[PDB]
Amino acid sequence: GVCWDTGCQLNAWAVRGCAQYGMRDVNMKSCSGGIIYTCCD
């Protein structure tokens, strides 16, 4: 049971999704153009 959110993600511009890292998202943050995804487990 461990979580961790990453800074502003710009990669979202082209493609997004916690799946990219091989985990499930739990929360997100506000970002101009991009979006933050909190992957856990």
Q: What are the E-state strand segments in the chain?
A: 3-5, 24-29, 36-40
| Separation CA 31–CA 23 (nearest Å) | 21
CA 24 from centre of chain: 9
Per-residue tokens: 27: 């929360």
CA 21 from centre of chain: 9
Q: How far are the Cα atoms of 1, 20, 24 from residue 35, in angstroms, in the given order?
A: 23, 14, 15
- Bridge-partner residues for 3, per DSSP? 40
User: What are the boundaries of each domain within the chain?
Assistant: 3-40
| Separation CA 32–CA 41 (nearest Å) | 27
The method recorded for this entry reads NMR
- Bridge-partner residues for 4, per DSSP? 39
